[PDB]
Amino acid sequence: PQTPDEASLDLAATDGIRLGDRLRGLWDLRLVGGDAELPGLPREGLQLVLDVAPKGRGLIGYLDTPERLLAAEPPRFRVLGDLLGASSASIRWRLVDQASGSVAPTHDCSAVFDEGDGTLSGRIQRLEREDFRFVAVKRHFPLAHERIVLNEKLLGWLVSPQHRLFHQLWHASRDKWHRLSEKQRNALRGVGWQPGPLDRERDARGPRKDRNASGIDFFFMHRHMLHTARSMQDLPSWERLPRPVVPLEYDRPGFIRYFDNPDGFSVPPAWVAVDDDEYSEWLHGLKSAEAYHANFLVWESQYQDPAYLAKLTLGQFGSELELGMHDWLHMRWASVTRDPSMTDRFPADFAPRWFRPENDFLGDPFSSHVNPVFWSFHGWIDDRIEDWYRAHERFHPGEVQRREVEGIQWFAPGRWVEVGDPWLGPATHGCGELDVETMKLALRIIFS
Amino acid sequence: PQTPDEASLDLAATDGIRLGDRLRGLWDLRLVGGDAELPGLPREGLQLVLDVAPKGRGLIGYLDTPERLLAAEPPRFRVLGDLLGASSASIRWRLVDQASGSVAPTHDCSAVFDEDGTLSGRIQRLERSEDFRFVAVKRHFPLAHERIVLNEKLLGWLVSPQHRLFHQLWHASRDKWHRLSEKQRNALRGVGWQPGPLDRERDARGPRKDRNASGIDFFFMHRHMLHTARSMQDLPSWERLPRPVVPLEYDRPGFIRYFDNPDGFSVPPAWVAVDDDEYSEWLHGLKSAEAYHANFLVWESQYQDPAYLAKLTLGQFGSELELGMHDWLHMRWASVTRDPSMTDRFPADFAPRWFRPENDFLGDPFSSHVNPVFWSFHGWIDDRIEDWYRAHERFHPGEVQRREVEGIQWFAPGRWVEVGDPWLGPATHGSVELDVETMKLALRIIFS
Ligand SMILES: [Cu+2]
Ligand SMILES: [Cu+2]
Ligand SMILES: [Cu+2]
Ligand SMILES: [Cu+2]
Known part of the structure; x- marks a missing residue:
């Protein structure tokens, strides 16, 4: 041999x-x-x-x-x-x-x-x-809530069933719309929970997602959640995206600190899903330094480049960013799911244990808003709307105009703002505060 | 779309x-x-x-x-x-x-x-x-020779045609031997240039290379070359292999410093070979950081692991190291070939320019030893022969005995040293213009 x-x-x-x-x-x-x-x-x-x-x-x-x-x-x-x-x-x-x-x-x-x-x-x-x-x-790898503390009132609002269920249903409805049957659609329209305008809904994931103005809903809604949340605690934006851990060979003290998660912005290490190598490999990739340099740094560049943004309506921009960068920000700072003391929570499992403050899993909109890191990157996402305004004020002067909508600094319709009625759920678009049992029900319609 | x-x-x-x-x-x-x-x-x-x-x-x-x-x-x-x-x-x-x-x-x-x-x-x-x-x-990324200075005495030896052709032929004879016909092999024998003992030759790259004792020639000859160079100049071994450049994000001065090659040990940037993508990617690879962490660091550990070295004879150790780590060390620190004013010097081309000090190309034994970094890693290699001795002194006490051979500190034949007559060309197993001509002939026979 x-x-x-x-x-x-x-x-x-x-x-x-x-x-x-x-x-x-x-x-x-x-x-x-x-x-x-x-x-x-x-x-x-x-x-x-x-x-x-x-x-x-x-x-x-x-x-x-x-x-x-x-x-x-x-x-x-x-x-x-x-x-x-x-x-x-x-x-x-x-x-x-x-x-x-x-x-x-x-x-x-x-x-x-x-x-870990x-x-x-x-x-x-x-x-x-x-x-x-x-x-x-x-x-153990410290979790964000062990390192960034959300105060009594804020946490109360985040952990509460009114809000968790709102957030989950808001995503579920727009996310699943294009795959939901005419029977399911009417069930939701009838209970006031269709995504956007009745019979002209703005699905988040169907074939015309970039143009149908779903982007605006996404941007606006989280801005509104930002305003509400920021009135109860100082939740500053990241200005720059955290860089991956400095390797041990170049800066030994910096490497050790990283694994103590001093600021809550350390990337929780990837976990292995049992029997799901496609999923284990996918999560591993997006949490790696390769990802930072191939995808995240690119997004950080593109969304502060005037020339890039100036090609894009608000709703095109929202769609691109929700579906690419945003879904990846969530799972990159995601920590493995826990209990009151395996596999993720089923979408319709409303067991009291799932409502605790211990549940801040970034992968599920029922829980993700509870995780402190959430506010840093939704903060960062939100500030890029201003870069986009400036981009247009440079290339297309006075072709988008500022305007107050639902108590929030926003933007009048125009060539680059496709719609003036952003969807905050029933309040703005229901043609049948919010009822917990109505929400529970609508989620059941959506998940078979 | x-x-x-x-x-x-x-x-x-x-x-x-x-x-x-x-x-x-x-x-x-x-x-x-x-x-x-x-x-x-x-x-x-x-x-x-x-x-x-x-x-x-x-x-x-x-x-x-x-x-x-x-x-x-x-x-x-x-x-x-x-x-x-x-x-x-x-x-x-x-x-x-x-x-x-x-x-x-x-x-x-x-x-x-x-x-x-x-x-x-x-x-x-x-x-x-x-x-x-x-x-x-x-x-410009500075070259090793612009930063480590080999003195006039040593340099003069290394550049001289006699030593250049020796180093090339010492390698070529043993490297091609196994592919040489019995006509080519007798010509070399009759000129004193067969790789080791007459009719019992120690081919470096043949099927039985690991066990034919060739590896001992490899280690010994370079020990001999080292001892000679060191008499004329202080040439310390690397103790630890140089790590890849520190990224700009974590240490901006260190990054900058690296491209000044301050100590001669920076990895020269991989060059694109025109119309050879197999070569271009291969070069890129071994000069990469992935290569450091996947092969070079592994080699660094393995060859200072007593349990690893104590499995191997000296002739196995030497063969394993030459064919893997040693050929890759050369290309890792190589900068591109340049005519002493693009494309590589062919083996049999003895045009006077190739002899000038400026040809210190690490890829080719005709020039590789003129590069200052040659001596740094060959010393690291030669120091590892002592890790190997200590390894057998631990697992097989007394089974490897020291000895002096051709003026150099070495080891006797035994269970773990398969021969005691190391090869150094004609001087051990066979005026200067006569033998530079002998050597040129011998190289031409091999390369037709
Ligand atoms: Cu989000
Ligand atoms: Cu959300
Ligand atoms: Cu060498
Ligand atoms: Cu050599």
Whole structure:
């Protein structure tokens, strides 16, 4: 059996990619056994930071006290391994004594992974020349609500059944319209919950979505939610999109901070859906740095470029942005769904547990508005409407005009504003505050 | 014509990758025309630094004076752009006045390639409905030899025809041997140039390459060359492999510094081979950051892993390293071939110019050793022979014994050293004008 003739670029495949994901981050480390000590270091209160590149097979990291890992000077021990032949059963790295003035390894680590949490555990050996063991427990990735706090009144408004159900139904109706039957459509029209004008509805996802002015509804509605919300708390826009985590090799203290989610804007790591590799791969892609540089940075550019925006009506712009960038902002800062203590909540499951403040899942409009990060990017989305106005004031002077609609700064109809009646639901368009049971009912019509 | 239903991960295709590589780095810049001014900045002596991710479509960067681009405080102008439907004809970015307290763009920039070339462009102030131009010339990526200086004594040895042809023929004989006919093989034998022992030759790339002991010739000869070079100049080994450039988003001075190649160790940018896309992509790959994290970091760990090295004889180790890591180290640090005033020097072309110091092309053993970086990584390689000895000194104590061989510190034959007569051309297994002629002949026999 012949050895290779040359090297080829051997990027990590799925198993490797996923193992790296389980390794990557900050771990709490204890030494254990009779002869278990590292020079300069206690046996408890240690930490282990590990990194692996997005498609990398190398494994790097550091081992010192927490305060020393955030420090400027070199950490006492450095990690160098690789993942060839690695799995949850065997993961090996070497330790380099960085005080010693030699890069020759001083230790041989071997580990077993169990179970963003997890456990690494195994044996160490002094290579110089015995019962030497360690146990490392991965720190949880902090959630946004643990880092941005929404005040008593605001949260009350967000978590409430009036609002959750409004938000869910508002999307469900416009989102599903083009696939709903004439029987279902009449059921909704009759109960005042059709998307927009009766018999001239503005479906969000059908073949003429760009032109039918559904874009305006999207932009306007969330502006109205922004005004209401901003009257109860200072919810500033992001001005720039968060950049992906600075890799461990270039800025070690910055990497560690990131996994503490200091500002709530760290990207929660991707989760694996069981039996759904299409979905696991899709979410992984959109949360990656490749996505930031291929898609998100482009959107950040396009939607502050006058020449780009000046080609577009308000409703064309709204459609493009809701369907591309907006749906991806949600799932990129999405954290895995939780309980009162698996798989996502079914659309019609109105169990009391699903109404808690603990439920802020960004993937579902019944919950997404509760997540703090929501307000930063809907904030950012909303400010781009102003860029778009300026774009037209430059290229098409006085061809869109400012105007107050439903107590909100907006824009008169014109060549670049297709409609003057934005859809806030029944208040503005019902021809049969809001009834909770009417909403529950309309959602049932929509989901079979 | 319907719009997209959703986003997908849209990485750059070949055209945008290459365009990205043309932009990336440091440009000198001056403004031209009657109305050409930026507030707080001279009309000339400016610099523009740009980055694009490996497979990014986004374009970022900064525009300021050189000292300001290297400074800790934020530059006056930030570039935000994208490359969608850009090309050498049209390239667009917005500028943001970071002194202004707003991220709204203040200028629309547009540029064309003037066919490491040159951009001619226009800028429009975004507060008007002018003659405002700029000319930007990309800075040359310095070559290793412009930054690490091999002294007159050492350089003279390395460039001399005798040593150039030796290095080429030492490699060519063993590399092609397995493909050579018995006519070609007897001619070389009768001139003293067979790769190792007469009728028991140690081909480097044949079917039994891993086990025929060839790998020992590889390690030894370069140890011998190293010992010679080191007598004339202090040439330390790399201890750790240089990491890829730090991205512009996280460390803007570090990024800029990189394209100055301050220590000779920056990865020279991949060149497009005209009419060879297989080659163009392959080169790009091994010079990439993915390559560092997927192959090079793996090699770095593997060859300092006692458990890995202790599976291998010296002749296996040497073969594995030569064919994989060592051929890729060469191309990774290679800058393009240049005639000492486009296309590669053919093996049998002994035209006097190719002998001049300026031919230090890493791709070809005729020139590779003239490159200063050659010695840095060959030292790293040679240091790893000691990790291997310690590995067997741990798992197989006493089974590998040291010995001196041809003036060089080495190892005796044994279980893990399959031969004790390492090859160095005619001097071990066989006035200067006679043998440069012998060697030229020998190279011509091989290359017909
Ligand atoms: Cu949203
Ligand atoms: Cu919404
Ligand atoms: Cu070499
Ligand atoms: Cu060589």
